[PDB]
Each structure stands twice: as C-alpha cells, then as structure tokens.
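Re-running La-related protein 4 to confirm reproducibility after the cluster update. Everything else is unchanged from the original entry.
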Amino acid sequence: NSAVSTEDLKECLKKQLEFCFSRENLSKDLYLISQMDSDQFIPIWTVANMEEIKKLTTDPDLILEVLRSSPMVQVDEKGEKVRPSHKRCIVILREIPETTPIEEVKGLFKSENCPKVISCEFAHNSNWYITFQSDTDAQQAFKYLREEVKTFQGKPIMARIKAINTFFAKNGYRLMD
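Result of re-run:
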C-alpha cells in the first residue's frame, strides 16, 4: 500500500477527476470553469498542470491518456482541449399509474429551490420524462423529489435522474438505462 507502484496513483487521479466535475465542484471551480477555452474546453495545459496532479508528475502527453478513465468526462481527441460532462436535466418518474393525471405528477416535480417544470410529457415505460431548465436545478431538484415523490397520496413512487450521453456508444455498460 506504500510503494513506488504507479498503479496506486492511477486510481488516485480518478478521485481528483471525479470531484473536479462534481455539480458543486465545477460550478465552484473558477480555475477550470474560468480557464475554459471556447466550447467549455479547458486548455489541456492549464489542467495538466493542476497542483493536485502536479504532485503526481509533469507528464503532458500521459495525463490526458489517463483522464480517459472518467466516463463522465470528454477530453479532446487531439489531446489539447477538454470539457467536463455534467448535464442530466430530465427527471424520470416511474411506477406512475396510467390513470395518473398530469395534475398529480405535475406537483410531484414541484421544487422548493428550483422553478416550475419546463416540460412534462408522458414517455413510454410508465416513465414520465420531465425536462427542467438547468441540470444544477434539475439534479438539485431531484434531491427534493426523493422526499416528495417518496409518496403520493400514500403511493410510494420511484424515480431516477436521466443522464444524457452518447447514443451510438458501447452497450458493454453494465447499467441498463
């Protein structure tokens, strides 16, 4: 557990990465968010030289090769830019009785620190695809639903935050939808 094997550090880089692009982390990461090139891309250099990793080493061409270990992150294919992936704005309300009026589910989205739903439509799989204005609000709103949706007229309901990503991606992903 205490050697010179880089195998240990490899796993460590993850933590940094995973936290950097956290809802509260990025939104509060001027260094990254403020350095962001034109498409929210971060100059590969500004980051590749982050103190956290600066302790790791000074390998420019290598760092990005590891970053690929962050599925929720998208690094430039050329290895010169990169933008963090943090969307997920649509909320999915499942187990909603086909006889459940839009009125009932309408308030189940109701948020206390977020504005009213932007769009609420019935999507197959008894799952209602409600679209919020912004992820920061949606995701945060979902945190409130867990308390409200937890029950409806005494009817316990389950829901999951809908994340957006590549469609033609690999299905190898254990998690299914």
